[PDB]
Each structure stands twice: as structure tokens, then as C-alpha cells.
Amino acid sequence: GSSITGISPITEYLASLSTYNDQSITFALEDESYEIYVEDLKKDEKKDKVLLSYYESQHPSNESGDGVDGKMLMVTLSPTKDFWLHANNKEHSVELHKCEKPLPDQAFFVLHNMHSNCVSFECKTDPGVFIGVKDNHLALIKVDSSENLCTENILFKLSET
């Protein structure tokens, strides 16, 4: 009856999101405001790191799914404590929100490989949508798996410091 809840975390580590344009995503947290903007890098300066975690989805056999030996690995990004990255379809943008322990489908983002070390975050509840820097902040970039392969804005980089 359910295949979303009841899972377990694979691995957790710190990693800052960096655009393919050699830029890092700055998460400014005010008294109660949430401002996000991408800043350009120059030297090896330890910027804001986001707590990323991996999650594996288990599909039922002999019923529905028909896997091909390669379950999609989801990922959760948390630059703060209880506030996680949630994809708001309202304005097609990602905002930090504090929800209960049972994280919704809008929390787990299916990670996908793009380049040698580049990665992209895909929406599990809304396939076809990938996280990415829109104008100058994080937003939901609607990109296809072929009709739009040339998209540097949807290219993320992880730094293991």
C-alpha cells in the first residue's frame, strides 16, 4: 500500500552546491526571511556547505514496477537544521521549509549524472523538473531528457571538503 515511507538513509555528508559556471550557491538566512543568490568564486574559500543524504527506493516485485537492475537513488539537501529543500510548484522555485520527520515526495530528489563529476536533482513527484539556477537563485528548471541536453544552469557541482 505504501512504497515511500519506511526507507533508510544510505550515507550523509557535507557538500556545497556549485554551478557549472564556477560559482557557488549562497544561502542567506535572515531573522525570518529566505534570500538565495549565486556568488562567483575565485580562491579556495570554504563557502556554505549543504548536508546531502542518499536514499534508495524499493519497488515491489511480481506486481508492478519491472526494474532493470538499477533503482533510482534519491538525495536530500539540508543547508540548515530542520529546514529542507522543498520544490514549490506554486512559483516553480525551491524554498527551505521545516516539516515533520516523514519527508514528502517533494523532499527526495532523484539524483542523475550529467557529466564526469556534474550532477542534477530531479523531482520524484514531478518528473521532468530539475533544480537549477534560474535568474540568480535556485528554482525549478523544466528541462527534458533530450529536447534540452544543453543546459548549464541545471548543472550542479559537489565539493568534498
Swiss-Prot record:
Impact of mutating residue 35 to K? Decreases affinity for IL1RL1
Transmembrane domains' residue ranges: none
Name the domain of life: Eukaryota
Mind telling me what this protein is named? Interleukin-33 (109-270)
Organism the protein comes from: Homo sapiens
Designated gene of the protein = IL33
